[PDB]
Design a protein around this ligand. Structure first.
Ligand SMILES: [Mg+2]
Length: 177
């Protein structure tokens, strides 16, 4: 069995100044961790969510997906629940409980209105489908909001300034989740 990693990436206006940090992290994880036995998908969200790269193990498609992420221009609202929903839909189509799926959400966790309730519910759906949910926090991120989305506080990592966050997340994923 081999991992399917779903990157769910915040392109809202709030994170716009750190889009390059988000992008670099995605590339680092894809290159350092996502082996030929693994697959990945790239999803972005603001007021709408989009699959930039559908789930694939093809390294050529992954490179083209990274090029596409380079061209993203963050602006707009933060409907993270719709990004999670597109990961869950692909997970369901791949076989739900029969897959080893990992969701990695890159966000500041700055959510309003009913969006926290929607996001927490969609992440509980992800766990029910057998996925482990991670959050990688951007800027002055909301620790507690990320902890209610990720499986646990041990699966929340800062994108910047943390001690060995990349190694830590790899180690976490490999230890099952
Ligand atoms: Mg935002």
């Amino acid at each position: 069995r081999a991992f399917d990693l779903y990157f769910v990436l915040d392109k809202s206006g709030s994170v716009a100044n750190n889009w390059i940090e988000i992008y670099n992290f995605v590339q680092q994880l894809a290159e350092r961790f996502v082996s030929p036995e693994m697959r990945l998908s790239f999803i972005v969200f603001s007021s709408q969510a989009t699959i930039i790269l559908p789930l694939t193990g093809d390294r050529g498609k992954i490179s083209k997906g990274l090029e596409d992420l380079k061209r993203v221009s963050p602006v707009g609202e933060t409907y993270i629940h719709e990004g999670l929903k597109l990961a869950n839909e692909q997970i369901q189509k791949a076989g739900g409980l029969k897959t080893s799926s990992i969701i990695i959400a890159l966000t500041d966790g700055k959510l309003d209105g009913l969006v926290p309730s929607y996001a927490e519910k969609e992440a509980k759906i992800s766990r029910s489908l057998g996925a482990s949910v991670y959050c990688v926090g951007v800027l002055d991120f909301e620790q507690a909001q990320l902890e209610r989305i990720a499986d646990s506080k041990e699966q929340v990592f800062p994108v910047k300034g943390g001690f060995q966050a990349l190694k830590g997340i790899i180690n976490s994923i490999l230890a099952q989740s």
